[PDB]
Amino acid sequence: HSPASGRYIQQMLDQRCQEIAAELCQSGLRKMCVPSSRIVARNAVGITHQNTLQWRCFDTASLLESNQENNGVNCVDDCGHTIPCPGGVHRQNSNHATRHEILSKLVEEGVQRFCSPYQASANKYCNDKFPGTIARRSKGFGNNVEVAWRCYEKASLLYSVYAECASNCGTTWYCPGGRRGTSTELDKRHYTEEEGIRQAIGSVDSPCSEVEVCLPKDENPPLCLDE
């Protein structure tokens, strides 16, 4: 067991999408008759005129290796936040099935099971103060060593990079969506909020007695062990 998110919500979305592609194929939709290694869920734009961010089931063979403007794909952390992950949508040639309602409902279900109350609290602090941001302890602009608690705009995070987050005991944990400390415009898009985030984390009630030891887990609740 690593002290890290299992990315269980994302895993549930991809499985549900593999099921939907298999049903579509059975319905005659030939382009969806693929092995399950070819299907993932992404939160993204679709083809031309599909311009909002929706949960869709994509054939990875139709995804671009990288994105230009508004066409990147997003994956989801175990608190239900969407974060850039590798790939881009081909606006003419994408092979996908938009399934926003079922996939959103699985995200809400997963958030109840997996999202650390301590992380929920830190994310809420960030969102209230800077709409759209989530909390990580990670890199800032042009410095690839130093970490601090910051409210990060989700578009500036990288799902493939794990960064420190709060476990469900309020202890060190690592979650997808991190910074590299590089020097691009995206690397500027955060608000360092060391005191406010730490207080938000500290205000959460322990799931354990003041005499028990909280051992965190990648799904709620953590272990409470007698001292």
Ligand X SMILES: CC(=O)N[C@H]1[C@H]([C@H](O)[C@H](O)CO)O[C@@](OC[C@H]2O[C@@H](O)[C@H](O)[C@@H](O)[C@H]2O)(C(=O)O)C[C@@H]1O
Residue from 12, 13, 189, 214 touching ligand X (CB under 6 A): that is 189
Listed in sequence order, the residues at least 6 apart from 16 whose beta carbon sits closer than 8 Å to its beta carbon are 41, 99, 102, 103, 106
Asked if residues 98 and 90 have their Cβ atoms less than 8 Å apart, the reply is no
Residue from 4, 22, 141, 219 touching ligand X (CB under 6 A): that is 141
Residue from 60, 191, 212, 220 touching ligand X (CB under 6 A): that is 191
Does position 181 bind ligand X by CB under 6 A?
Answer: no
Helix-then-strand count for the chain, H and E: 4, 13
**Considering beta carbons, is residue 142 or 221 the nearer one to ligand X?**
142
Listed in sequence order, the residues at least 6 apart from 192 whose beta carbon sits closer than 8 Å to its beta carbon are 140, 148, 149, 150
**Considering beta carbons, is residue 160 or 183 the nearer one to ligand X?**
183
Tokens 């690592």 appear where?
174
**Considering beta carbons, is residue 88 or 120 the nearer one to Cl ion?**
120
Binding-site partner at residue 130 among Cl ion, ligand X, none, CB < 5 to 8 Å by type: none
Binding-site partner at residue 190 among ligand X, Cl ion, none, CB < 5 to 8 Å by type: ligand X
Tokens found for residue 207: 């799931």
The residue number with the shortest CB distance to ligand X is 192
